[PDB]
Design a protein around this ligand. Sequence first.
Ligand SMILES: O=C1[C@H](c2cccc(Cl)c2)CCCN1c1cncc2ccccc12
Ligand SMILES: O=C1[C@H](c2cccc(Cl)c2)CCCN1c1cncc2ccccc12
Lengths: 304, 304
Amino acid sequence: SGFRKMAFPSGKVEGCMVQVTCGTTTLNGLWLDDVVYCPRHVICTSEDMLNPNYEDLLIRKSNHNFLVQAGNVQLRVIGHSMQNCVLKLKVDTANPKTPKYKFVRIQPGQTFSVLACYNGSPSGVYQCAMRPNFTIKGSFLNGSCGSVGFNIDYDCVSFCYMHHMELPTGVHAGTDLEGNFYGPFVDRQTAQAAGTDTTITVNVLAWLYAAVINGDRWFLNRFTTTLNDFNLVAMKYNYEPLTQDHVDILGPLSAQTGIAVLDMCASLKELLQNGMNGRTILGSALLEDEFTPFDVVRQCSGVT
Amino acid sequence: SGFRKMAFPSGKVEGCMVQVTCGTTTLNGLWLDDVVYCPRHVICTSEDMLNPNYEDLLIRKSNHNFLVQAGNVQLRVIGHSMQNCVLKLKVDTANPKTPKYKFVRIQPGQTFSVLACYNGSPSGVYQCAMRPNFTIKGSFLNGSCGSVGFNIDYDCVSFCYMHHMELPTGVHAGTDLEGNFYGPFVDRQTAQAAGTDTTITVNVLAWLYAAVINGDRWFLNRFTTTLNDFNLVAMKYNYEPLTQDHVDILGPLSAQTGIAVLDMCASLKELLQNGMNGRTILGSALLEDEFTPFDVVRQCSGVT
Ligand SMILES: O=C1[C@H](c2cccc(Cl)c2)CCCN1c1cncc2ccccc12
Ligand SMILES: O=C1[C@H](c2cccc(Cl)c2)CCCN1c1cncc2ccccc12
């Protein structure tokens, strides 16, 4: 029993973190095999962040200008190239701690663990979600760029995020491991619109299923609804429209609890229309949307 | 910017997790140097959990009855002994992955990271606090016993908790690494009273300071209070009484923000008396108490 905002164990990712310095800028890098991946703005000073021409700035940089340190040892840089918004620094030594890995571009609403890093050293791990507006509500200070987001399937690490930027709003933007930003964001210090952040409806329903499993049942009611009726309410509350794909994914949790997905939708509808009335669900006074249906089954079954 | 319920990186602890089996019972063990620490109820079947005589049960067990597996390799057990509620299994091989470590008995209100484990394999990491009633609101299923709680200071791991039990209430009880339970709990399957769970006032104030630092300021008011006046309100709301020691520890956050500790107390008093009125603080609709003043400074300064 108990339901926590749980992150994946970070050991496999810690063994990949390195420090990358170029000129006066220092950030984190990800060392997998003989390649170190990092945000391309490592070649930038604060001044050229206003309007950088990355290709022109990179021309002034040679292999020896990229200092890569793993713990206390220096890595020899034998190659450099820019792939979208990331630099790939080829080093002469394969990371002996490279786990089995994949690079994946996650979908909005999917969750992942972040290993926040400063100077190539890990400071903390937390779980978060890719918001529908392609931002992440992280916890990142200056120097945390190059910190990565990931998921683990038994022994395989699927890297899905690389931290690059903090918006003036305090939320975070970054890329997949091929250097493509999630959302419309550019690696420029300019005013950028994040967009309307809607609630991940399928995740809130999964979390309601987790609450029933863990004993919190006060919110279950005598009502049902339809997908279209529920969606009229979800629209009014800036909740993502629920589809049959979402209903299908909630299948296992619906079977585990014996509560039909549309009946759970009616409970959600009533919570949206009436509020929590001063009560809590799984120690929260708001509807939590950073647990996917897969996360709930995993945490409630103890997959290692 | 951003404030997350952040856990320590778990790599150092993952390298210590092993599986311990005795008879038909399997749980987790902690391998440090040539010793494996685990809950003493590993010698128990479900039947003798009702009223076990651990010393009599242990008499029927020899070194070869304790199977200790680290990954896929078996460890040879050359010694066994019971220290309070934990067993110490001496093995013939020192853990090559043993980090610098200490065993510490934490104080109620202190926080720590938990690496939940099943069959000696890590499944997830989350941050939690030792409640004033000596329980932890964890996320643990059957098989998670022997999972440990810890803190990290640069490279030293301070082990502070070993999971043993889930109370009928759904909360968790366990021991320090010398086998002494936190609180009044016994390792018996019997009805046990957890006690009144009060809110950790100094932690809520630290979290309010973190909110001001991260930009959420709506709750700051034009009022002040005294320690005695504040405590009259804290009593009414089952909040821990605030002392001058708590005020002194909030010193650095008070200096960082320029908000006197008693002025922040008045903001807290008003939030307790008036509620949140449908608003949030750091993405929460309730007052969060699982961040110590040390946690807030660390997360807001990026200590690795
Ligand atoms: O956002 C940035 C800068 C930036 C500006 C424009 C585009 C890009 Cl790609 C990056 C570069 C310096 C580091 N950085 C930061 C990244 N995360 C958290 C931060 C917390 C406080 C202060 C800066 C932070
Ligand atoms: O609580 C217990 C049992 C127990 C009973 C009485 C005293 C002691 Cl020391 C231990 C032993 C089996 C595992 N266990 C569990 C520990 N944590 C989470 C659990 C979630 C669901 C079911 C059992 C859980």
